[PDB]
């Protein structure tokens, strides 16, 4: 069972996580009408610019984050930004919608402009997340755990990050035993999903440059976070 300190930590992580754009806001736009690859690339860059901004504010509220080395603070943000974006997309994808809606959303994403090469692994990851039947708290804690990964490249003080990640891992493990007591492998399955997240980060720049558009225009903020322009 969670302690008073863990219950406090969980609600605080939840409130900060809830400051994001609503899944319905995103799915309403995609489902409403079909767009060209040019319009979809523009929708994606704006969605991703908003995501980075909201992620920086979420990251700042993570306990102990502001006490870390400033250069390590940047390495953590640069290292998790794309993974956090794909995890959020996976959450929105697996949110329950009326009959036939999730079939149309999938078809709309498949024909967004992205090359077929990246479509299959992206939907494989999304569908694997859905099979886990994750609660909102599980997605929030997993995002926090992704940001506070000490095994990130360029990190100077790995132990300082470890100290921050460990209490979040403990809370998630307790929720996994409470939410799914019939599946004792649930916690391990979520941690396993983080390795698949890292593959999308390796092919992120190619996914964007292979989009079916004549010009790949990026915002100055996206140029800092993504390895583009």
């Amino acid at each position: 069972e969670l302690t008073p300190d863990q219950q406090t930590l969980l609600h605080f992580i939840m409130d900060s996580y809830n400051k994001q754009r609503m899944p319905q806001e995103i799915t309403n736009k995609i489902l409403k009408e079909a767009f060209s690859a040019e319009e979809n690339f523009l929708i994606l860059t704006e969605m991703a610019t908003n995501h980075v901004q909201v992620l920086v504010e979420f990251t700042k509220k993570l306990p102990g984050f502001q006490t870390l080395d400033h250069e390590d603070q940047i390495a953590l943000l640069k290292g998790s930004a794309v993974e956090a974006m794909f995890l959020r997309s996976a959450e929105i994808f697996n949110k329950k919608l009326p009959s036939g809606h999730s079939d149309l959303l999938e078809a709309r994403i498949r024909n967004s402009g992205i090359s077929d090469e990246y479509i299959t692994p992206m939907f494989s990851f999304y569908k694997s997340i859905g099979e886990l039947k994750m609660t909102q708290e599980e997605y929030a804690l997993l995002t926090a755990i992704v940001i506070l990964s000490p095994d990130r490249q360029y990190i100077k003080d790995r132990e300082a990050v470890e100290k921050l990640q460990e209490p979040l891992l403990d809370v998630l493990q307790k929720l996994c035993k409470i939410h799914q007591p019939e599946n004792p492998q649930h916690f391990a399955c979520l941690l396993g999903r983080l390795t698949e997240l890292r593959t999308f980060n390796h092919h992120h720049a190619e996914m964007l440059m292979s989009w079916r558009v004549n010009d790949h225009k990026f915002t100055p903020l996206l140029c800092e976070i993504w390895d583009v322009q």
């Binding site: 901004q53 920086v56 700042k60 400033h70 603070q73 940047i74 943000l77 640069k78 100055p220 903020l221 800092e224 976070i225």
Partner: peptide, 11 residues
Amino acid sequence: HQLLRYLLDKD
């Protein structure tokens, strides 16, 4: 990364 630095250092 001056934009990220700005977003982290701002109150």
